[model samples]
Target chain A: PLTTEQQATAQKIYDDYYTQTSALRQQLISKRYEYNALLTASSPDTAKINAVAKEMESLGQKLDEQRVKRDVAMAQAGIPR
Target chain B: LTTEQQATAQKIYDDYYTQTSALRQQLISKRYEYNALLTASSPDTAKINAVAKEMESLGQKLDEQRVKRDVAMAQAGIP
Candidate 1:
């Protein structure tokens, strides 16, 4: 079992990571919807499609980065995963 | 993971799973609603704004739960 202090710290870090990544996930969701709307259109606009695609890509990368950062934090905090 | 951590992790996971899943679905639905409103012939700004706000709140809830799960998994040393 983690020490009392360790447990508290781990818990806090978990929540922090959750808050950070959740926001990113929301952005991803919104962007994906925008991207889908573009692709599903009868006459898609190439420029708009490309722009949305680019934004989505960036968000996706950020999401991945956040996950990695959370993992590292967990490790440093002596959490299991 | 230690036995104690494993047990602790499972309990936390189960506790949050249902609520988190529901919140996640709510966020997804709101996203769709907002998108639908946006694509409407004449968009309703008020309704869209309401949906967007609700979506933001729900997304935060879902994200909090997800992070909780991640932390539990980490504590358990789960892959």
Candidate 2:
């Protein structure tokens, strides 16, 4: 299915969405380890949590944006239609 | 043993090798992701890791089998 609104725009967004999100995924994983190591070395600091959480939120937002773009794309494609 | 049959089989085997190589590379990339998660303390995502690892092993099998297929076709060149 595809979105009825801005088909070309939505497709472009989806393509870039995956590209950026892929990098986000890698960074998130890396930060997770950095946080784990910090926790193991001592008590977990607020900075560690804050830094990781901020990136997590950033990545989550990107994912949500893709979902909306996908829904729009699907609606335009008319899968249920 | 016909020329046409031999050519068809050779093409099929080559295609398999090509696809197997692709799968191998894809699996390696996935494995890197899996390892990253493992370090992050989310090693519980076992299903994906195990499945990718298994698929990679199967790709290796296909690669090996393709070699055999090549030899068979060559000898039967019966070319």
Candidate 3:
């Protein structure tokens, strides 16, 4: 038996959300690397650690927020529902 | 003969630019995936959830990026 769900928009929304979120993910990557380098550097400056931590934390929040929005978008677009 | 040569040169230039741009864009997704695996830590449930979501999104984006890249290259008249 075939499920009667027709979700043409689901694929497009999924694609667009992926495109947007992935770019953001790349930014998070860069920030995390900077954070890691600062954490592991020879000097181990606490200020640098604080700053990098702030940036990483901010990026993480943004990613999480986007993910929530993405899930909603996907559902409305008819994904897995 | 000169016109044909010039057309060939133009195609080469266009193809190179397209390929370069595409390659750079494609790197975006891979970089995300690399960072996800490298940086993911189980500090808490929230952090774990975030990492899992990022991984999922990155996979889809990488596939889309490759699709666009192939289309771009195909349109550029270069093998």
Error of 2 at A49 (Å): 1.4
Q: Whole-model lDDT, candidate 2?
A: 0.62
For all the predictions, what are the DockQ values? 0.05, 0.06, 0.03
Clashes of 2: 8
In the range A4-79, model 1's lDDT, one tens digit per residue, is 8888888888788889787677767777776765665545589988998998899899888877887798898777
Q: How do these models rank on lDDT, best leading?
A: 1, 2, 3
As a whole number from 0 to 100, the lDDT of residue A59 in candidate 1 is 84
Using TM-score as the measure, which candidate wins?
Answer: 1
Encode model 1's per-residue lDDT on B14-56: one tens digit a residue: 8887767667555665666688567554578999999889988
Per-residue lDDT of A1-81 in model 3, one digit per residue for the tens? 224354556656667777877867776776776566555443468997798788778888988887788789876655675
The candidate that wins on DockQ is 2
Better of 2 and 3 by DockQ: 2
Q: Candidate 3: lDDT over CA atoms? A: 0.62
**Model 1 interface Cα RMSD in Å:** 8.5
Q: Can you rank all candidates by TM-score, best first?
A: 1, 3, 2
Task: Give the per-residue lDDT of model 2 (tens digit) for A1-80.
Answer: 55665566666666776785676666666665554444433234788667867776776677677767766775675445
